[PDB]
Design a protein around this ligand. Structure first.
Ligand SMILES: [Mg+2]
Lengths: 299, 248, 402, 267, 298
């Protein structure tokens, strides 16, 4: 049972079509990342999964139903970007307000206040909250009830990397239960260990969708092999130039090789066999570099 | 019902508004200070209390609800609330219930201490006439406040920023209190050959501040038409606010 | 119509003095000889309802102690109770009781007539249009009408073109007009009391007269009405609670909302030390009646103090001393009797109400409360009104309420 | 100079405030309308006491609309902490804001009372042009000083608060207290005591209100009727001359600017 | 030696929110302050800018006092959130800051094109996005040849094409000789461009030094994953013989938590037997180092 089946929508405002022929299929437990610019390519495709807009030349099937049914929205969390809650209300009363609207039990408010790390700042006003403190409150209303779809629009903005890794540990706890979620983020290093399949989309279209092993296989992107003092930089800079790979001439005792990842099975055998591996880092082309390629593939 | 679950928010968020509690205290102080100079110094002082609540109960209603729709849009919670199991009708009508019971309490602190300052400083006030002339006063001041509450929902849904909502809430307060009657007087003293002055007792029905005073000053119409015309100013402007809120 | 000699008068003293004993009589009676006749208190000279009951045609007749009852009512043929001819000079009419539907004391062409201490009860059923006058005076010079009691007549003490005469201390109750004046130049009236009357004092076209100390208690629609009076003197009058109403005939006046003083085309007169109390209008100043000395009065309790439908300024303080106003919210720093700020009794929005009565619906509006404050802040929109520099701080009429 | 470089900003930022240009054109169309009604009624002490009351309601209003968000509008906007990392002081980004917002009030009243003079010299035939220039020159160089008081009042209530929504409450509180509450507190003290509270102290309470010192300067020669002044009839009891009334208006600037600087120095 | 903080233990409210941080910054280095948004990191940010007084210690920015006007023309501060002046334009805001900092007015036209904001020049700041104001906030920081940048989270609300172009603009200024301080919370990605990190927590500066020093002075596992191995069942055991946990999540997804003391023999296990597909030797990143030192402090 696929959660979000965006089936050939084409959303337009006037004469301009801000989203053309988008065809998504989010699975039952996948963590998808809607990556793109902050303009109307992504932020209207985020609204069709919600009940906010309507597909002008297609249809969306959120949880096998229409996206504006009340049975859908009781099991649909949504953390929006740049949210600022009611500042004269308190942190516990804001969740007690949002639990009554979603039909969640009131015994889940103090559970989720402890779960997101807001136990110390409960019963304090939202005006005396930080930016990352309100993101913990905005995450906590998305987990209200038993949601089966989350649209976390930029969840780790203004969050510390302890709390950011606490958030992605809550993501991998959620998707094991069967809650397939959607990332709409911009901090692209970091998310790639938890994104099940990226959904990098341009101004109008959907550029590429699929897993990280499928984006690296289709888009030919070079591997970032870094070393530090194997034998000598100048004795190793010459070797990749006859074999057809880029060897970057770094400062001293460091060999950065931008190789084409097709011959690198046996290329690493000679790299291990003649020197010590004491500081190396072979990096696959990241989601920051994949998004940089697909923006130049269209635009 | 989710019309009450969002109404308990606006009670809890509206009663902690520092701007409202300053004016609602100033409304209750000036309602005692008018009743102090109307008893120690009853239709002459209940008319001066009507001029106070024509100044401030539109101002109390527009201070509560100028940022009801667009204040949630700027805060981002309006986009969040529509993804909840909530219609756009239940957000607006639930805000009208929540902000409505605030100024249904602000006249009980406003006129609850003004009717206390009359019933305890005349010593022979004949209180059977007091609890019917003030019972008609507290009810009709809420209905005046519920018009300007619904007027504030019209201007909140139309604008896109919170700063221009207060520029229209000041404009609605100026036009409906002291610009419409100044151009009624200017239609008298500057135009006399083509302005029938018998039409002017009927032209007060196009102004909810004017219908508020006419059921505290008792006229070609009876009293019951003005009560059904004050409630029609609520029901039209709430229906106008719901039609604007469905086009965001 | 018999004569006074046709009765049986027992002479007490031989100086043309007679005394009628107790017992009723019948018909009209006529005095043709200068007889200073007195009467016992049981001398009920009751006419049958026609003709003048006690006609007097001889000079120097001291009528005293009679009790007249039920004379005629033909006002065109002037059926009085005491008819006094022009040849009946220096008549004294002392301490009499009258009850009948016509004129009580009709005098005409007389000199030095004295109408003292009488009780003239007019009527009960007639519509105050045919009751006849209480003390009618028609062009008399020298008269002295003092301390009578006129009740339920038509237009009270009517006076027509009578030059020099005093009206001292007489009580006038439940009549149409209290004291009526028609072309009575150089007159005088002191300390009279008018109660429950459709106009307390009618002052029509009579110049140079002194109106002093008179009282008007709970009269209807016109406290003191002055029409075309010049060089007069209004000192010490107490006009209290002029309620609204109508005279019922609308002959010489109109219906009013209740005015304690109504000045119509009276150019020069001194209006000092008066007391206009608890009426709807304290004083009505018409546009033709301007520039007269109005200083020292007490305007207490009136719902509207001055009605002045004009744009000409009108100072109301001669010799730097003004009037006491009850709603004067002013101060007195240097401890004299006068206030420090001047008192404008009228706004601009207080005169839109007179021009247009539909502004009464707008009278409770905040815009009117704005417009009352815009006049107090911006004096360019203030029309020149009826102000007085140095108004009084305390009551000057501490004696007139007694 | 650094005091002018931040004055050149506020001179070019306050003139883009559309709420300023509404109520500074409202000051222009009312000062023409008052001077036309002062021309159509011809009086002379009534067209001075109404213009001085017009600038009592509006020149504190333009000053408090300008400068309520001068310090706290930069503090919560993030650009105040940035400005202290520029070669400036807290005394230069305050006096520069006072020079920058002060030239707006010097221009909002030169537009207002400038067209008020042109609606008299082109309206009243045979008016004394020497008396017109002196009386309306006294209106120009003293409504700036009333404006510069409430400009310096707004810097006091901006450095003290830390939220711009509460600065607008205090700027509305200062505009209500000094204009039409202190004129009513002094009136109710005089009415209820009937002028027998203090016969010598009460004219000196006009000097504790800069709108009353402003009204006493312009109503010096054109006193006229007593009811046209109201509570300013107490200024005849003041034994100080007119030159001290200028100096108490300048002392209301310098005390409430040194208070505005001592508050801002510990921001 | 641009910023020479020595021995400073800042007290305010008798709280002692900073203690004895010895933060020497070189004349070409890119430092990164990596505390929380609380009184440890943002107090030391205010000390370098000179708008705070260092109690019990001395701060020497550019060899002089931190509040001198001669060195404050040589600073550049990108603050946290600057909605600058919504009625002013883009050029007029930057011409205002060029007049204050003593910069030449010809630098404004070549900084609104160096930063990508020439399309939105002469347009009002109320019509700017959050990323366009960070572009304007960077534009006043590079104003009049600054010898010390100080960027406080410059890559929030910014596109990753612009974020990668911003770090190339940082690396342009590093070669010019301008020390840069990056008070940031977007720690994945910033470790490739900084020279020395400075993780400070609860006031006390916990760790300082380069990324090679923070991995040497703190034993952290290198995260070798070898996706696509031939045989996996013996590969559950063949790495754990020397204490390297062969943890997997798929058919062949063995992300071997190593010890970084046996990197020869674990890679000889991988490359001697079994063919790989895409090895990913993940060195301990700045997220893992920050999660070590903050956990070591509490
Ligand atoms: Mg005095």
């Amino acid at each position: 049972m696929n959660a979000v089946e965006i089936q050939g929508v084409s959303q337009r405002y006037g004469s301009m079509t801000v989203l053309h022929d988008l065809n998504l299929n989010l699975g039952e437990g996948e963590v998808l990342g809607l990556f793109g610019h902050n303009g109307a390519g992504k932020t209207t495709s985020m609204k069709l999964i919600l009940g906010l807009l309507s597909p002008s030349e297609g249809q969306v099937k959120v949880l096998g139903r229409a996206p504006n049914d009340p049975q859908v929205r009781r099991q649909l969390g949504y953390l929006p970007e740049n949210v600022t809650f009611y500042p004269q209300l308190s942190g516990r009363e804001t969740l007690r307000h949002f639990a009554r609207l979603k039909g969640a039990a009131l015994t889940q408010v103090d559970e989720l206040l402890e779960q997101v790390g807001l136990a110390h700042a409960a019963d304090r006003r939202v005006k005396t909250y930080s930016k990352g403190m309100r993101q913990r409150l905005g995450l906590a209303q998305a987990l209200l009830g038993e949601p089966r779809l989350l649209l976390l629009d930029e969840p780790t903005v203004g969050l510390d990397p302890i709390a950011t890794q606490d958030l992605y540990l809550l993501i991998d706890r959620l998707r094991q239960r069967g809650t397939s979620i959607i990332l709409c983020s911009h901090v692209l290093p970091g998310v790639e260990a938890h994104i099940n399949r990226a959904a990098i989309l341009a101004k109008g279209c959907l550029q590429a969708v699929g897993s990280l092993s499928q984006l690296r296989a289709e888009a030919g992107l070079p591997v970032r092999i870094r070393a530090s003092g194997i034998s000598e930089r100048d004795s190793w800079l010459q070797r990749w130039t006859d074999a057809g790979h880029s060897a970057r001439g770094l400062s001293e005792s460091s060999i950065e090789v931008v190789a084409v990842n097709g011959h690198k099975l046996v290329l690493l055998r000679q790299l291990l066999g003649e020197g010590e591996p004491e500081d190396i880092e072979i990096h696959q082309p990241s989601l920051e570099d994949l998004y940089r390629y697909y923006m130049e593939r269209a635009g | 019902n989710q019309v009450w679950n969002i109404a308990r928010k606006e009670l809890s968020d509206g009663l902690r508004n520092r701007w409202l509690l300053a004016i609602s205290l100033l409304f209750a102080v000036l309602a005692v200070g008018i009743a102090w100079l109307g008893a120690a110094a009853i239709p002459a002082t209940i008319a001066s209390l009507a001029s106070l609540a024509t100044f401030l109960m539109p101002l109390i209603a527009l201070l509560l609800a100028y940022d009801a729709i667009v204040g949630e849009d700027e805060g981002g919670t309006l986009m969040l609330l529509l993804t909840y199991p909530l219609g756009r009708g239940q957000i607006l009508l639930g805000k009208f219930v929540g902000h409505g019971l605030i100024l249904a309490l602000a006249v009980l602190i406003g006129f609850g201490c003004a009717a206390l300052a009359i019933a305890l400083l005349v010593e022979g006030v004949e209180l059977g006439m007091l609890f019917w002339a003030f019972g008609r006063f507290m009810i009709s001041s809420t209905l005046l406040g519920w018009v300007f509450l619904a007027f504030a929902y019209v201007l909140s849904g139309k604008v896109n920023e919170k700063s221009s909502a207060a520029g229209l809430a000041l404009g609605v307060w100026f036009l409906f209190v002291l610009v419409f009657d100044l151009v009624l007087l200017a239609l008298l003293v500057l135009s006399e050959g083509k302005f029938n002055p018998e039409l002017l007792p009927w032209l007060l029905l196009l102004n909810p501040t004017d219908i508020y005073r006419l059921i505290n000053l008792s006229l070609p119409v009876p009293a019951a038409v003005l009560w059904l015309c004050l409630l029609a100013w609520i029901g039209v402007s709430l229906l106008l606010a719901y039609a604007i809120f469905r086009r965001r | 119509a018999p004569q006074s000699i046709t009765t049986l008068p027992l002479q007490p003293d031989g100086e043309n003095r007679w005394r009628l004993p107790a017992g009723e009589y019948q018909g009209q009676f006529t005095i043709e000889q200068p007889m200073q006749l007195r009467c016992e208190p049981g001398a009920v000279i009751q006419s049958q309802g026609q003709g003048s009951s006690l006609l007097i045609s001889a000079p120097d007749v001291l009528v005293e102690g009679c009790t007249l009852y039920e004379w005629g009512s033909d006002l065109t043929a002037m059926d009085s109770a005491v008819f006094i001819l022009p040849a009946a000079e220096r008549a004294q009419i002392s301490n009499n009781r009258m009850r009948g539907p016509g004129f009580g004391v009709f005098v005409d062409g007389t000199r030095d007539v004295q109408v003292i201490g009488n009780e003239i009860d007019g009527d009960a059923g007639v519509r105050s249009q045919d009751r006849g006058n209480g003390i009618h005076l028609f062009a008399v010079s020298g008269a002295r009408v003092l301390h009578n009691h006129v009740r339920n007549a038509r237009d009270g003490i009517y006076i027509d073109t009578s030059n020099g005469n005093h009206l001292e201390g007489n009580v006038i109750e439940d009549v149409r007009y209290g004291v009526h004046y028609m072309f009575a130049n150089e007159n005088s009236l002191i300390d009279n009391v008018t109660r429950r009357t459709r106009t307390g004092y009618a002052l029509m076209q009579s110049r140079k007269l002194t109106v002093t100390g008179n009282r008007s208690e709970q009269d209807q629609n016109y406290g003191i009405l002055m029409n075309y009076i010049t060089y007069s003197t209004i000192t010490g009058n107490f006009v209290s609670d002029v309620q609204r109403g109508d005279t019922g005939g609308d002959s010489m006046i109109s219906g009013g909302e209740g005015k304690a003083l109504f000045i119509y085309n009276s150019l020069f007169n001194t209006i000092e030390n008066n007391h206009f109390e608890k009426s709807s209008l304290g004083i009505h100043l018409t546009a033709g009646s301007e520039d007269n000395r109005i200083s020292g009065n007490a305007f207490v309790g009136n719902q509207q103090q001055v009605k002045y439908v004009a744009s000409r300024t009108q100072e109301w303080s001669v010799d730097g001393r003004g009037n006491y106003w009850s709603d004067y919210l002013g101060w007195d720093r240097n401890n004299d009797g006068l206030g420090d700020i001047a008192y404008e009794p009228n706004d601009n929005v207080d005169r839109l109400l007179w021009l247009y009565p539909q502004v009464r619906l707008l009278m409770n509006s905040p815009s009117i409360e704005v417009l009352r404050w815009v006049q107090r802040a911006f004096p360019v929109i203030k029309s020149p009104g009826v102000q007085d520099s140095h108004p009084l701080m305390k009551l000057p009429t501490e004696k007139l309420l007694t």
